[PDB]
DNA sequence: ATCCTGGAGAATCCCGGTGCCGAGGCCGCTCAATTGGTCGTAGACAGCTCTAGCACCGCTTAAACGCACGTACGCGCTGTCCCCCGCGTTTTAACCGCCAAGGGGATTACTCCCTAGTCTCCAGGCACGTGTCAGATATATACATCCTGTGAT
């Protein structure tokens, strides 16, 4: 049994990834969401967040 | 009428202290993320067809290009006038803090029933084919609108 590990850490991100994946698959955006979509998106939201805050 | 200091008079910035309540860090806990395995089908891939988008040619001709004339428009200048602005005094009700009441939003537990998912069967709707009528084209005639002269007022 591997230890549970936050994806944000894995991706080197501060924004949550599992949650983004979760949001993407529902809200009825699509029947299915690919593994790399949540990750790509989390990076984008984080990037923009940084620009405004900076 | 317009430029140049120099002062007076507010208004706005900076300085230092009060004090408060909103941010920031800590603890419990709970339920949403993670893991791990199974199933099946959406998407990747290769192959093939053949539509339709590119390139080229020559001819016809309606649009585009450039020029010359002249005048309606844009622009600047002047003067009137009147209607906003800025100030001061009076009047209003917005805001604040406190209180009480209760209406309606939020959560809980439970149960159907109203939908998704399945299979079967047939007729409603799309791709193709064919015929002819509506609208486009072109001809020619007649009516309506526009712009100088021309007399009347």
Curated annotation (Swiss-Prot):
<feature type="compositionally biased region" description="Basic residues">
    <location>
        <begin position="1"/>
        <end position="8"/>
    </location>
</feature>
<comment type="function">
    <text>Core component of nucleosome. Nucleosomes wrap and compact DNA into chromatin, limiting DNA accessibility to the cellular machineries which require DNA as a template. Histones thereby play a central role in transcription regulation, DNA repair, DNA replication and chromosomal stability. DNA accessibility is regulated via a complex set of post-translational modifications of histones, also called histone code, and nucleosome remodeling.</text>
</comment>
<comment type="subunit">
    <text>The nucleosome is a histone octamer containing two molecules each of H2A, H2B, H3 and H4 assembled in one H3-H4 heterotetramer and two H2A-H2B heterodimers. The octamer wraps approximately 147 bp of DNA.</text>
</comment>
<feature type="modified residue" description="N6-crotonyllysine; alternate">
    <location>
        <position position="26"/>
    </location>
</feature>
<comment type="similarity">
    <text>Belongs to the histone H2A family.</text>
</comment>
<feature type="cross-link" description="Glycyl lysine isopeptide (Lys-Gly) (interchain with G-Cter in ubiquitin)">
    <location>
        <position position="5"/>
    </location>
</feature>
<feature type="modified residue" description="N6-(2-hydroxyisobutyryl)lysine; alternate">
    <location>
        <position position="26"/>
    </location>
</feature>
<feature type="modified residue" description="N6-(beta-hydroxybutyryl)lysine; alternate">
    <location>
        <position position="26"/>
    </location>
</feature>
<feature type="modified residue" description="N6-(beta-hydroxybutyryl)lysine; alternate">
    <location>
        <position position="3"/>
    </location>
</feature>
<protein>
    <recommendedName>
        <fullName>Histone H2A type 2-A</fullName>
    </recommendedName>
</protein>
<feature type="cross-link" description="Glycyl lysine isopeptide (Lys-Gly) (interchain with G-Cter in ubiquitin); alternate">
    <location>
        <position position="3"/>
    </location>
</feature>
């Amino acid at each position: 049994r591997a230890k549970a590990k936050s994806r944000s850490s894995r991706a080197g991100l501060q924004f949550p990834v599992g949650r983004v994946h979760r949001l993407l698959r529902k809200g009825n955006y699509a029947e299915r969401v690919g593994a790399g979509a949540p990750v790509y998106m989390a990076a984008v939201l984080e990037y923009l967040t940084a620009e405004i805050l900076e």
